């Protein structure tokens, strides 16, 4: 399930 900002920031 998507975590906003997790691509750039974990």
């Amino acid at each position, epitope marked *: 399930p*998507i*975590t*906003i*900002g*997790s*691509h*750039a*920031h974990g």
Partner: antibody, heavy 113, light 108 residues
Framework: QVQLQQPGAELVRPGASVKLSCKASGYTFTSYWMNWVKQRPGQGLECIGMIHPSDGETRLNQKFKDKATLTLDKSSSTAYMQLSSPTSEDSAVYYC??????WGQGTTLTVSS | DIVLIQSPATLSVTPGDSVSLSCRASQRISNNLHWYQQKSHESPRLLIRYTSQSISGIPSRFSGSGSGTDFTLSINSVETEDFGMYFCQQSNSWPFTFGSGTKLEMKR
């Protein structure tokens, strides 16, 4: 580096389908959701939907259920969003972004005969 | 769909002023609220995620607060590079929705 590469502009005749591309590089393509966002210039932002390249699981905004189709070409790390039967209401900028942190530059789609 | 209401529509400031931007949700969304900045001819930029967690490198003048249905973006002392549009977005329920935006412009 992470890149999401979108063409700057596409032109489409009304009623003719168009497929917009978002070419991903510099990360594991199957590790993150790919989202599509619509913006009519000077206006707000709308979530079109998202697809996970792991297995192609797709979530659409019901508003676009008869308009937008999300697909992939995983071998070339590309996400596609196809618009069916475009009308002047479909002329907008379309962005791809993964987790709303990395964003493409957006494609300006213009519908005209 | 969850509705996000932003206010004011426009904020007119002099560099150095402090501002507060409001986002209110139509139902409880917990801490699942993000703020974006969008400058003319640019894609949006994630400023603050999950209410208050500032993005690496975003200047420290920016902060987010609130919970439940009531959220605030604060900018401590506005710089000219801060002028543009600010949107809130909820990721509590699909479809994720954005507010209508607050424009921060230069006062004269």
């Amino acid at each position: 580096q992470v890149q999401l590469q979108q063409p700057g502009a596409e032109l489409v005749r009304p009623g003719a389908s168009v497929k917009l591309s978002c070419k991903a590089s510099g990360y594991t393509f199957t590790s993150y959701w790919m989202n599509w966002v619509k913006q009519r210039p000077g206006q707000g932002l709308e979530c079109i939907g998202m697809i996970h390249p792991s297995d192609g699981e797709t979530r659409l905004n019901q508003k676009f259920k008869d308009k937008a189709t999300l697909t992939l070409d995983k071998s070339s790390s590309t996400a596609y969003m196809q618009l069916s039967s475009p009308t002047s209401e479909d002329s907008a900028v379309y962005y791809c972004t993964t987790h709303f942190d990395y964003w493409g530059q957006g494609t300006t789609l213009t519908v005209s005969s | 769909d969850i509705v996000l209401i932003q206010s004011p529509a426009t904020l007119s400031v002099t560099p150095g002023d402090s501002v507060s931007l409001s986002c209110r949700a139509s139902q409880r969304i917990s801490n699942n609220l993000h703020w974006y900045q969008q400058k003319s001819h640019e894609s949006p930029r994630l400023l603050i995620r999950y209410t208050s967690q500032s993005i690496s490198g975003i200047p420290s003048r920016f902060s987010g607060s609130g919970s439940g249905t009531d959220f605030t973006l604060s900018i401590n002392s506005v710089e000219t590079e801060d002028f543009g549009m600010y949107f809130c977005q909820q990721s509590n329920s699909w479809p994720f929705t954005f507010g209508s935006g607050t424009k921060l412009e230069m006062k004269r």
